[PDB]
Ligand binder design. Structure first.
Ligand SMILES: CCCCCCCCCCCCCCCCC[C@@H](O)O[C@H](CO[C@H](O)CCCCCCCCCCCCCCC)COP(=O)(O)OCC[N+](C)(C)C
Lengths: 69, 57
């Protein structure tokens, strides 16, 4: 029965280790992502949460019929 | 925040051109033809400094 239908314990052992490593990495990544999101929303210095500002290319840098603009 | 620096009254004293608008308009073309260099210097100062206090002379 063991030869025909089942395998050794080493296979399940090492598969369990691989699964545990994947899940632990995923958990640490989720926590890190939450912290990064909080920091980016608080500060705004990162790529995320970059709300638009007025484009400076719309400014007209020409004499304005009045020296004091 | 800060103190605005203003010229003294003696710095704003000059001989005034006290002819009316009709005299000025009658003379305007020749006046622009002849007195152009100081006028353009003053206008360049005016449009480059953006400050009346820096173009009194
Ligand atoms: C000498 C023996 C004397 C005593 C007899 C004891 C009787 C025991 C037989 C009863 C078997 C119970 C069913 C349990 C089947 C386990 C299914 C599965 O777990 O096994 C698969 C193995 O496949 C097997 O071939 C399963 C075949 C059994 C199919 C059962 C069907 C029986 C129904 C018969 C009904 C009658 C039909 C006629 C209708 C009129 C696993 O696939 P695989 O990942 O690859 O193999 C991994 C292990 N290896 C790598 C070491 C090989």
């Amino acid at each position: 029965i063991a030869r025909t239908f089942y395998d050794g314990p080493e296979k399940n052992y090492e598969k369990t280790m691989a699964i545990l490593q994947i899940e632990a990495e995923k958990a640490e990544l989720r926590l890190k992502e939450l912290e990064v999101r909080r920091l980016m929303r608080a500060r705004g210095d990162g790529p995320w949460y970059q709300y638009p500002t007025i484009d400076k290319a719309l400014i007209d840098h020409s004499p304005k019929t009045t020296p004091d603009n | 925040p800060g103190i605005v620096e203003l010229p003294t009254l003696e710095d704003l004293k000059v001989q005034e051109v006290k002819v009316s608008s009709s005299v000025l308009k009658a003379a305007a073309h020749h006046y622009g033809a002849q007195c152009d260099k100081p006028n353009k210097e003053f206008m360049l100062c005016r449009w480059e400094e953006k400050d009346p206090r820096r173009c009194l002379e």
